[PDB]
Structures are given as structure tokens and as C-alpha cells.
């Protein structure tokens, strides 16, 4: 598919762009609305909807537990969408989020100099809408699990069972079974690379970045 190839490839590159922006702005003090973008941008793209977007900007400094080796973030977006993820000391987020946290203001929002308009516009100015980042994430999650499968499972399941296992894992990971258009685009894409006799054998020795690149090289061609 022409369209989906274009987008996947577009985001793989756009992501490279948002990461430079990040490494620019995180050096920018704290109070900077742009330093606050770079921190939120880091939080977004590091997906490892609209509802929970609210809760994050509705994130109070008093729900951000901070300790020597971790930071536990807690929010509730429209009842059901309640979460409590953690950030480990080593992870890219810990320090900028440590610097962003103001403990002298428990009831004020972490991302106080940002909101709906601020974030949304940033990302879109990168050449991709929200949607583009979301489907990309599921494609990234599918490729990650697929990758993870080929190096952990010996002997290998074979193209159809490997693919089916990866979709199931991505549904378990992302929380829901992705669209049929999405599953179809990823299974096909994978069945077409599998036509190469050494594809799987090489993937079993790639790092995830070598692999993701091999996949962009293919989609781009």
C-alpha cells in the first residue's frame, strides 16, 4: 500500500526530528513552555488517545512521587482512564521530569505552561497529525514484538504463526486488537520481507534499531 508506506516512513523520520527538538529544549531551564514541550514530546513519542491527554495536562505535582531511582506518575482521566506509570533513573525522562516537577505547588499542574493547543500544534508542525503518531506506535509495537519473537524463540514458528503470535502480543500490550487495516498492513509487509531466505536468520542477530531500519528500507522500496 502506497499511502500506509508513505506515513510509516514519514513518522520514522519525523520521530528523528522530534528527538533533536527534544535534545534542544530539555537544556532550556524549566519554566520554558518549549522545555515543557520537549518533556511532554518525550513522554508522548515514548509509547512503550484524547481522553488521557487531558489527564496528563491535568497532572498535579502532588501525584508525581519522586525517589532516588524512580518517579511514579499518577492521573485519572474520565474515571476509567486512571493510570500510575513509573520512570526509572537511567531512562531519558527521569531528569527532565525531575526538573519539571515543582513540589512547592501540589495542586498546580506539572505541565502548567502547556495545554491542548500547545502540544497538538507542536506535533502537527512536524508534518504528522496525531493519528500518524498513534498508528505508527502500534506499527512500532508490532515490529518490536515480532523482533522480540525471532530472537527469543528457537526454533522459529514460521511466518504465519510468528505473525499471529505478534498480533496477539500487540493486542495484549496496547490493550486492544488493532484495526484489521492495521493488522493486514503489518502481516503483508512482513510476509513480503520473509520471501528473502535470510530475512528471519538476519533478524535473529539484529539489534531492534538495525531491524527497524531494515523494515523502513523495505517499505521505502
UniProtKB/Swiss-Prot annotation:
Keyword tags: DNA-binding, Isomerase, Late protein, Topoisomerase, Virion
GO BP: DNA topological change
Mutation effect (residue 134 to K): Reduced activity
EC number: 5.6.2.1
Result of changing residue 131 to D: Loss of activity
Reported function: Releases the supercoiling and torsional tension of DNA introduced during the DNA replication and transcription by transiently cleaving and rejoining one strand of the DNA duplex. Introduces a single-strand break via transesterification at the specific target site 5'-[CT]CCTTp site in duplex DNA. The scissile phosphodiester is attacked by the catalytic tyrosine of the enzyme, resulting in the formation of a DNA-(3'-phosphotyrosyl)-enzyme intermediate and the expulsion of a 5'-OH DNA strand. The free DNA strand then undergoes passage around the unbroken strand thus removing DNA supercoils.
Protein name listed in UniProt: DNA topoisomerase 1B
Highest taxon above the source species: Viruses
Organism: Vaccinia virus (strain Western Reserve)
Location(s) in or outside the cell: Virion
DNA-binding as UniProt keyword: yes
Impact noted for substituting residue 128 to P: Temperature-sensitive for DNA relaxation in vitro
Induction (free text): Expressed in the late phase of the viral replicative cycle.
Site (Involved in religation): residue numbering on this chain: 79
Family statement drawn from the similarity comment of this UniProt entry: Belongs to the type IB topoisomerase family.
Keyword check for Repressor: no
Domain Topo IB-type catalytic: 1-221
Catalytic activity: ATP-independent breakage of single-stranded DNA, followed by passage and rejoining
One annotated GO molecular function: DNA topoisomerase type I (single strand cut, ATP-independent) activity
Active site: 185 (o-(3'-phospho-dna)-tyrosine intermediate)
One GO CC term on file: virion component
Amino acid at each position: 500500500n502506497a499511502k500506509r508506506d508513505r506515513i510509516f516512513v514519514r513518522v520514522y523520520n519525523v520521530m528523528k526530528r522530534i528527538n533533536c527538538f527534544i535534545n534542544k529544549n530539555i537544556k532550556k531551564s524549566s519554566t520554558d513552555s518549549n522545555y515543557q514541550l520537549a518533556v511532554f514530546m518525550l513522554m508522548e513519542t515514548m509509547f512503550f488517545k484524547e481522553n488521557e491527554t487531558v489527564g496528563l495536562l491535568t497532572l498535579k505535582n502532588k501525584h508525581i512521587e519522586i525517589s532516588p531511582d524512580e518517579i511514579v506518575i499518577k492521573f485519572v482521566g474520565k474515571d476509567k482512564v486512571s493510570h500510575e506509570f513509573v520512570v526509572h533513573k537511567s531512562n531519558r525522562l527521569y531528569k527532565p521530569l525531575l526538573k519539571l516537577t515543582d513540589d512547592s505547588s501540589p495542586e498546580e499542574f506539572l505541565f502548567n505552561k502547556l495545554s491542548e493547543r500547545k502540544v497538538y500544534e507542536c506535533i502537527k508542525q512536524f508534518g504528522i497529525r496525531i493519528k500518524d503518531l498513534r498508528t505508527y506506535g502500534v506499527n512500532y509495537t508490532f515490529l518490536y514484538n515480532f523482533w522480540t519473537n525471532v530472537k527469543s524463540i528457537s526454533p522459529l514458528p514460521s511466518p504465519k504463526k510468528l505473525i499471529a503470535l505478534t498480533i496477539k502480543q500487540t493486542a495484549e500490550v496496547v490493550g486492544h486488537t488493532p484495526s484489521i487495516s492495521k493488522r493486514a498492513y503489518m502481516a503483508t509487509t512482513i510476509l513480503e520481507m520473509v520471501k528473502d531466505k535470510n530475512f528471519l536468520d538476519v533478524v535473529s542477530k539484529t539489534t531492534f534499531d538495525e531491524f527497524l531500519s531494515i523494515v523502513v528500507d523495505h517499505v521505502k522500496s
